[PDB]
């Protein structure tokens, strides 16, 4: 995953608003670390093709302004509320030895072979996708698998019942707020 980027040496409301309608660009920044933030302009045509991918946010994405390159992460993208296109991508850096919090999407694999789906008539209820984690960057997962091959009609799978890459701290288990991740419920 590679993004091209440029310098963006002019800032403000009316300047940023005329990149979007004249040039077709998006503003962005890289800031993360103990270092200097950098304003970045970027193309809307290519940032939407990156957001097409299922692993856009939970993946190390390369970026170059000129010849300088960084291990960059997409942290809290911003979006048009009406038409839904990206404005202000807002990236991170990577310092390779701290904990680098991000969001990781979910799969919910075994939904056809489920004891609350097959024998007793019930349907699944996705309550939460894209759990937010805190993990060292080599153990930065694209995915977290959620198994539902034993959940019954009425049983709730929580984040306590969850799983993998084992070097990935879930932020919600760090506090007493344990979140319910899926259900099997009786039909309406």
């Amino acid at each position: 995953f590679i993004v091209n980027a440029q310098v963006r040496s002019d800032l403000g409301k009316g300047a940023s608003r005329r990149l979007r309608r004249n040039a077709g660009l998006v503003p962005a920044v890289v800031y993360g670390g103990d270092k200097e933030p950098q304003s970045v302009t970027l193309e809307l045509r290519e940032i939407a093709k990156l957001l097409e991918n299922e692993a856009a946010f939970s993946h190390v994405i390369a970026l170059n302004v000129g010849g300088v390159k960084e291990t960059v992460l997409i942290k809290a993208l911003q979006r048009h509320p009406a038409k839904g296109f990206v404005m202000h991508a807002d990236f991170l850096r990577v310092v390779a030895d701290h904990k680098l919090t991000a969001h990781v999407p979910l799969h919910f694999i075994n939904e056809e072979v489920a004891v609350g789906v097959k024998q007793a008539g019930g349907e699944i209820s996705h309550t939460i996708s894209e759990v937010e984690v805190s993990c060292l960057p080599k153990d930065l997962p694209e995915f977290i698998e959620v198994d539902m091959a034993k959940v019954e009609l009425g049983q709730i799978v929580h984040l306590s019942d969850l799983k993998a890459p084992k070097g990935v701290e879930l932020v919600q288990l760090a506090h007493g707020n344990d979140l319910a991740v899926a259900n099997i419920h009786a039909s309406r």
Binding site: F57, R79, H80, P81, G84, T127, S129, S187, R188
Partner: protein, 136 residues
Amino acid sequence: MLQPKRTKFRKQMTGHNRGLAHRGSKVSFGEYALKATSRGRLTARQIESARRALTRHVKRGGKIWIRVFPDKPVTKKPLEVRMGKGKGGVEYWVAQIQPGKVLYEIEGVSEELAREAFALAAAKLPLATSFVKRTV
């Protein structure tokens, strides 16, 4: 239909409906949603009529979320009534909606049936709406 069970005051002003819906704009509970793209008002029997078109079209299951809620009182003058004898009585309820506000949400449904369900819903609504998916 949908009212508040109580209100602090029986009447509001007329107000305005400016801005975009930066809140209420993400698909927060379902996978697919009917997002509005123009501003307007929904008179709480536009809410229920589109709700009954949704639940009736799916016919098997899925969970449906109603993200909009009519909360402000709207007051009319009856006929044979001169202007200005006090403010008229409440008649219905209305949700002030902006461009970008998610109206309805659904899960447990195929993507081809959700588009067919929210097209039944959007025809009973006075808005310019759109179909959106869950982003992240």
